[PDB]
């Protein structure tokens, strides 16, 4: 009900299903006179579905908070929101090439296509997503957010290839001791978690780093399946006992040196995101 966010229901005109997310499903849509550009301006529309259950309409105010907070370039913007005439809905930055993990398989079969024009990619474009990801989370960690959910399906590309981190329906406020921790179960897939958070609930920036650093693997195998053909429920032994994904085909010695590093079992050895930002610069430069 806040009237800087608040947007005229009749204003709005929902299209076509986009895919859905975490609590709901995200539709394109347009928006009349929105913050005073003259005319339609296209947008995204998150929504609950029908049978929602608290945890998923919980999860959608926790992102609308979160976002009416937060202003950076590569993350999916907040415009406003209708709550009053029907079903609540928040409306959100479009991003023409969908989500990151979408457009980088795309490009294992169209357009030019990975080489070493946004259909064009080389290892340097790989970087630069990175390296633009890593700025977000960077602003992130010093807000004081743990984004938790941190994958390729949850970075948005948008004109101009432009990262946009989204889905923040499971990102949570650390004020205080610096950490985020739930007694019950979290809803994060396995296979992306930080091995303290795994083990023992426990969610900070660090763990965000370890997500990080399998959204890295994701990347250089062009929107590859984590520990591909290993059971989820096998993570817990796996990473107990030292096993981290092995370095993949295009990526380079000092790429994977990174990859590791997020991986470290003792969070704080591993990188922060302003030194992830250093590093992916360094890499950029050296080429
Ligand atoms: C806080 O804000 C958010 O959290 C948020 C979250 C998602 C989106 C968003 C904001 N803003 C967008 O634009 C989003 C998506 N946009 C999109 C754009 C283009 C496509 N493309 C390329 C299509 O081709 C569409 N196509 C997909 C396949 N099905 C079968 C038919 C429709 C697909 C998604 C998208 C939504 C669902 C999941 C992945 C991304």
């Known amino acids: 009900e806040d009237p800087k966010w ?5 204003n709005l005109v929902l299209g076509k299903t986009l895919g859905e997310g975490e ?5 394109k849509a347009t928006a009349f006179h929105l913050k005073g550009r003259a005319g339609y301006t296209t947008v995204a529309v998150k929504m609950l579905k029908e049978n929602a259950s608290p945890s998923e309409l919980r999860d959608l105010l926790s992102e609308f908070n979160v976002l009416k907070q937060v202003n950076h370039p590569h993350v999916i913007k907040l415009y406003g929101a209708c709550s009053q005439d029907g079903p609540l809905l928040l409306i959100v930055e479009y991003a023409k090439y969908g989500s990151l993990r979408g457009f980088l398989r795309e490009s294992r079969k169209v357009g030019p296509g990975y080489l070493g024009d946004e259909r064009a990619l080389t290892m340097g474009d790989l970087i630069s997503f990175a390296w633009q990801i890593s700025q977000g989370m960077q602003y992130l960690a010093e807000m004081k957010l743990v984004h938790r959910d941190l994958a390729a399906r949850n970075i948005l590309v948008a ?4 990262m946009k981190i989204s889905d923040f329906g499971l990102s949570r406020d650390v004020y205080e001791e610096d950490s985020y921790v739930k007694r019950s179960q979290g809803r994060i897939p396995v296979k992306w978690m930080a091995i303290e958070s795994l083990f023992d609930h426990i969610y900070t920036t660090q763990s965000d780093v370890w997500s990080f650093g399998v959204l890295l693997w994701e990347i250089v195998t062009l929107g590859g399946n984590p520990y591909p053909g290993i059971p989820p429920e096998r993570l817990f032994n796996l990473l107990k006992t030292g096993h981290r994904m092995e370095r993949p085909d295009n990526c380079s010695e000092e790429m994977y040196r990174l990859m590791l590093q997020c991986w470290k079992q003792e969070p704080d050895k591993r990188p922060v995101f302003a030194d992830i930002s250093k590093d992916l610069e360094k890499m950029m430069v050296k080429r």
């Open 6 to 10: 608040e947007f005229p229901r009749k």
């Open 23 to 27: 609590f709901g499903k995200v539709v």
């Open 159 to 162: 004109e101009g290839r432009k």
